[PDB]
Design an enzyme around this catalytic site. Sequence first.
Site, PDB file in Angstrom:
ATOM      1  N   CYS A  12      -0.442   4.172   2.455  1.00  0.00           N
ATOM      2  CA  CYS A  12       0.045   3.732   3.768  1.00  0.00           C
ATOM      3  C   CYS A  12       1.466   4.217   4.082  1.00  0.00           C
ATOM      4  CB  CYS A  12       0.006   2.201   3.878  1.00  0.00           C
ATOM      5  SG  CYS A  12      -1.635   1.456   3.676  1.00  0.00           S
ATOM      6  N   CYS A  46       0.779  -1.246   0.000  1.00  0.00           N
ATOM      7  CA  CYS A  46       0.000   0.000   0.000  1.00  0.00           C
ATOM      8  C   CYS A  46       0.818   1.309   0.000  1.00  0.00           C
ATOM      9  CB  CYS A  46      -1.076  -0.065   1.118  1.00  0.00           C
ATOM     10  SG  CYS A  46      -1.909   1.438   1.609  1.00  0.00           S
TER      11      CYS A  46
END
Length: 104
Positions: A34, A31
Site C-alpha cells: 500500500c 500494509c
Amino acid sequence: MVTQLKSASEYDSALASGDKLVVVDFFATWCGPCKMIAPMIEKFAEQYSDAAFYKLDVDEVSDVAQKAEVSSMPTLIFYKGGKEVTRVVGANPAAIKQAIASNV
C-alpha cells in the site's frame, strides 16, 4: 490529489458521479505494498484529471470495506455510474494504470 473517504456517507456521494470514472484505493496503515504504491496513485491522479481519486482506510471504514468485499490490500475499485466496473487486488502499477486509462 487523492481525497480520503472518512465515512460511508462520503463513500456513497463519491460514487454518485455518473460517467465520471471514480477510483477508490482500499488500504491499511500496516500494509507495505500500500505504502509503496501510494506515490504512484498520486501521480496517476495528476495525469488522469478526467477521474476522481479517493482512498479509504479499511480500519476506519470497515463496514464499507466488508460491503465492497475487500479481502486484500491495496484494492483499487473502479466505479462508473455508481456501479463497479472493475477492480485491481494488489500493488500492481501496470494493472492500475491500464484500468484507469481504459475506463476514463
